[PDB]
Every structure is written in C-alpha cells, then in structure tokens.
Amino acid sequence: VVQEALDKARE
C-alpha cells in the first residue's frame, strides 16, 4: 500500500 500511498500523496 506504501508505494500507492505515496503516489496518491504527491499526485
């Protein structure tokens, strides 16, 4: 979920 949570955070 981490890499997806980051993307969602930045984007």
Partner: single-chain antibody, 235 residues
C-alpha cells in the same frame, strides 16, 4: 489481514575483524512490487544509544556514504545483508524493514558481537495508567513535505512501527496493535509532530523515535531519525 513478519537470523554473532558476515532477513509475505519490480526492503544499522541509521533501501541500493563492503541482496521473500570483511566500526545491530505495505514492520535484527534533524522532547517518567505527549520538531525542512513516523523500541532491541501522519492532509495510518494506545498529531505551524500514549503500562517503557519520509520524490525510505525520547513507566 496479517501484518507481514520479518524474521532475522542469526540474532547474535560473535565476529572477528576481516571475517565475512552474512545476515538473513525473511518476510512472511512478498515485499516485491511487480509494478516497478522493486523489493521494498530496507536495512538499518544501529549503534548503542543511537537511533537506527539507514543502510540500504529497495533491497540493494546503498544510501549515500555506506562503504562498498556492505551488500544488500535477495528478492520477494528472501533477503540477505552481507559485509565482505567486517570492520571494527561495523559492529552494532542490524534491522531489516518491510516497506511494501502497512503496517511497516521490522525484524528482530542481527547483533554483531566482537541542518536537517529532528528535535525530540526530553525524557519522561510516568505512572501506569497515565498518558504522556512526546514531541518531534523538524530542524532543516518543512514537515508539510514529509510523512512523520513514530517508532518504538523497548530494552529488547526490536523496532516497532507505531504509525505515521501526513501533515498536509492530516492523514494518519496506525499499526494495528497501537491503534488505541497511540494518537499522532501534526502542527505544521511550529513544524512539529506529536505522539500521545494513554493508559501507560510497564509494557510502554521504551525509547520512542520519530522519523520522516519525503513524499516529493518517487520513493524514499525513512532516512532522518531523531535521537529518541526515553519513556519510563515503572510498575
């Protein structure tokens, strides 16, 4: 849904200078992201009295400054850290961390036997049943640009992820076992992150560290760790 267990071995290992050491880190579940083919495994080196130092992330990429004699390898569920020729200043304990999916979990580690920073509040002495607030102030960057994490570590040595918050949207994520005992708050105004523990027991006696994770890069592990605040709950 489980948690993903990190099993490190050997736990202890008397070593003699020059020797070759090989530490193993296995995960209960895949740590591989088939999307970008990266293994979300990070290695930390920790000398006594200090907070974990970032060694390697994504399984094999060495952080800037770590000697070539250190090598991270493995894929999916089997990872290993190797020191081609152990040096003196190489001792300490080593932890591998699951950075693939929440909650982030650390292994028990392998103990080898022979300006950007985070300001943390003073040591605490508290009675069982009480609550205490710990503080973490970034001194070199804006916390609105990072995820502020809280890590626990009792005298044992095992690192325990408590949770993390997104100062920008106040979005927080908590490890299952700390979902009640902990509450993470952020105040971008003062650029400080707080952690509150309630209903303290002797099980809470430990060293609490805060850490940051940049969210502007595509990806980044937990690099900057505060010195930590010792919380003592005498039974």
């Amino acid at each position: 849904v489980r948690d993903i267990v990190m099993t490190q071995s050997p736990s202890s290992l008397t070593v003699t200078a020059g020797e070759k050491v090989t530490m193993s880190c296995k995960s209960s579940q895949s740590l591989l992201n088939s999307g970008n083919q990266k293994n979300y495994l990070t290695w930390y080196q920790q000398k006594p009295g200090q907070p974990p130092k970032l060694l390697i992330y994504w399984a094999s990429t060495r952080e800037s400054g770590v000697p070539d004699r250190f090598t991270g390898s493995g894929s999916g569920t089997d990872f290993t850290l190797t020191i081609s020729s152990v040096q003196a200043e190489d001792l300490a304990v080593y932890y591998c961390q699951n950075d693939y999916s929440y909650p982030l979990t650390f292994g028990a580690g392998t103990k080898l036997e022979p300006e950007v920073q985070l300001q943390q509040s003073g040591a605490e002495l508290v009675r069982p049943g009480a609550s205490v607030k710990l503080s973490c102030t970034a001194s070199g960057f804006n916390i609105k640009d990072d995820f502020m994490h809280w890590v626990k570590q009792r005298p044992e040595q095992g690192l325990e992820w408590i949770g993390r918050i997104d100062p920008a949207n106040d979005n927080t994520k908590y490890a299952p076992k700390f979902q009640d005992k902990a509450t993470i708050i952020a105040d971008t105004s003062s650029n400080t992150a707080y952690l509150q523990l309630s209903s303290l027991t002797s099980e809470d006696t430990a060293v609490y560290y805060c850490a940051r994770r940049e969210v502007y890069s595509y990806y980044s592990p937990l690099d900057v760790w505060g010195a930590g605040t010792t919380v003592t709950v005498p039974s």
